[PDB]
Write an enzyme that holds these catalytic residues in place. Structure first.
Site, PDB file in Angstrom:
ATOM      1  N   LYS A 109     -10.542  -2.408 -11.288  1.00  0.00           N
ATOM      2  CA  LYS A 109     -10.159  -1.514 -12.382  1.00  0.00           C
ATOM      3  C   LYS A 109     -10.844  -2.025 -13.649  1.00  0.00           C
ATOM      4  CE  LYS A 109      -7.124   0.573  -9.728  1.00  0.00           C
ATOM      5  NZ  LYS A 109      -7.300   1.976  -9.216  1.00  0.00           N
ATOM      6  N   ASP A 166       6.123  -2.134 -10.295  1.00  0.00           N
ATOM      7  CA  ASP A 166       6.733  -1.536  -9.114  1.00  0.00           C
ATOM      8  C   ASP A 166       6.628  -2.426  -7.882  1.00  0.00           C
ATOM      9  OD1 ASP A 166       3.960   0.896  -8.995  1.00  0.00           O
ATOM     10  OD2 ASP A 166       3.981  -1.294  -9.140  1.00  0.00           O
ATOM     11  N   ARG A 215     -13.145   8.700  -5.260  1.00  0.00           N
ATOM     12  CA  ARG A 215     -13.578   7.636  -6.155  1.00  0.00           C
ATOM     13  C   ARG A 215     -15.066   7.361  -5.934  1.00  0.00           C
ATOM     14  NH1 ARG A 215      -9.257   4.988  -8.441  1.00  0.00           N
ATOM     15  NH2 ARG A 215      -7.221   5.244  -7.425  1.00  0.00           N
ATOM     16  N   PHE A 223       1.067  11.244  11.617  1.00  0.00           N
ATOM     17  CA  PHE A 223       0.090  10.246  12.021  1.00  0.00           C
ATOM     18  C   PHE A 223       0.680   8.836  11.948  1.00  0.00           C
ATOM     19  CE2 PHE A 223      -3.333   7.255  10.897  1.00  0.00           C
ATOM     20  CZ  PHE A 223      -4.151   7.409  12.016  1.00  0.00           C
ATOM     21  N   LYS A 224       1.085   8.420  10.755  1.00  0.00           N
ATOM     22  CA  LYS A 224       1.640   7.081  10.587  1.00  0.00           C
ATOM     23  C   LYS A 224       2.879   6.824  11.454  1.00  0.00           C
ATOM     24  CE  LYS A 224      -0.405   6.834   5.990  1.00  0.00           C
ATOM     25  NZ  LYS A 224      -0.330   6.455   4.541  1.00  0.00           N
ATOM     26  N   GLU A 247       9.745   2.292  -9.822  1.00  0.00           N
ATOM     27  CA  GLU A 247       9.185   1.791 -11.066  1.00  0.00           C
ATOM     28  C   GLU A 247      10.250   1.184 -11.974  1.00  0.00           C
ATOM     29  OE1 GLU A 247       7.130   5.471 -12.396  1.00  0.00           O
ATOM     30  OE2 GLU A 247       5.304   4.558 -11.591  1.00  0.00           O
TER      31      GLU A 247
END
Ligand SMILES: [Mg+2]
Length: 335
Positions: free
Chosen positions: A36, A108, A211, A304-305, A319
């Site tokens: 970042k 978090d 990205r 899927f997971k 948070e």
């Protein structure tokens, strides 16, 4: 104290505490700031009577539509967050280092949600966002609170991925390999290119942004092959699917995936199987497949997971916000 990043010795001490802590998070490692690179890093820590680091928090400051900065410690701090008195001390150090530039300090941590914990946090002055905020939107939490985590410590004798599942699932995982799918892994530029073509192809097919490659290049430069690994699934010369996983602390985390269009011969299962094998081979306690937006069969991500995680999703505390500028906080943060 606040970490001086220009001091190699202090940085190494900070890093060794992070890497060795059972509470370590890759998004809390100093390498994360390099990923970042558009955010401002501010890191603090606490020491014991011995001068040994016992708690740390890596913050990243982002810009907002106001004169105040957004301070965020992704999945931090690194310590037992239920030890709230100590947390307060760590946060006080964080707040001092922010020197009044941010309207809030949000963190978090991956600690289970509980009414008791939520209440204690509120009693100590923090503003929590979990079962009380919107499931999605820009008002939703940055990271998903529901995550499909496979606890490998429940299978101490497991030697390969298959030993973790029921026969019905063993069959599903075997299918791609039977059909000729092969997976190779590492952290080379060639493998990154391979990941990037599937990643962007997948993005286009779903009409979503992606990205830039430079993001992953910085990641590749920040973490070695024992931390960052790219898995590439192919079948007789054709690239099918890929995935990126990061090993840090007590878990291997499945962070990114990509898949070409058309017939992929269930390559995504093969990718998952090898990431799990990596966790087994390195004796890692947990394999984190990431978040889901809803534990429902109407969610393709959950479906899927769920194939690889039969246990119920872990629900995190969400948070935790240390409000510094109340007026701006109310303007930029709502439920
Ligand atoms: Mg601004």
């Amino acid at each position: 104290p606040v970490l001086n990043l220009n001091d190699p010795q202090a940085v190494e001490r900070y890093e060794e505490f992070m890497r060795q802590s059972p509470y370590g998070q890759v998004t809390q490692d100093l390498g994360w700031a390099k990923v970042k690179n558009n955010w401002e890093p501010v890191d603090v820590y606490l020491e014991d009577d011995q001068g040994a680091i016992i708690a740390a928090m890596s913050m990243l400051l982002g810009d907002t539509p106001t004169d105040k900065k957004f301070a965020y410690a992704s999945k931090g701090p690194v310590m037992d967050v239920t030890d709230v008195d100590l947390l307060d001390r760590l946060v006080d150090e964080a707040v001092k280092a922010l020197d009044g530039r941010a309207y809030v300090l949000r963190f978090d941590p991956e600690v289970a949600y509980s009414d008791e914990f939520n209440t204690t946090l509120q009693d100590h002055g923090y503003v929590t966002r979990n079962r009380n905020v919107a499931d999605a939107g820009m008002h939703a939490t940055i990271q998903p609170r529901l995550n499909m985590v496979l606890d490998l410590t429940k299978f101490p004798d497991a030697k390969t991925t298959l030993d973790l599942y029921p026969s019905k699932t063993k069959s599903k995982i075997k299918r791609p390999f039977r059909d000729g799918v092969e997976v190779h892994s590492g952290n080379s530029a060639t493998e990154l290119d391979e990941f990037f073509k599937t990643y962007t192809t997948m993005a286009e097919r779903h009409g979503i942004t992606h990205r830039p490659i430079e993001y992953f290049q910085r990641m590749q430069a920040a973490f070695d092959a024992d931390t960052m690994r790219i898995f590439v699934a192919e079948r007789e010369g054709k690239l099918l699917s890929t995935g990126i996983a990061l090993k840090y602390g007590r878990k291997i985390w499945f962070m990114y995936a990509g898949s070409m269009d058309g017939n992929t011969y269930y390559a995504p299962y093969a990718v998952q199987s090898e990431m799990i094998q990596w966790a087994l081979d390195t004796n890692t306690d947990l394999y984190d497949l990431g978040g889901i937006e809803s534990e429902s069969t109407d969610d393709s991500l959950y479906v899927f997971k769920h194939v690889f995680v039969k246990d119920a999703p872990r629900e995190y505390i969400g948070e935790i916000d240390k409000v510094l500028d109340p007026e701006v906080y109310a303007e930029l943060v709502k439920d």
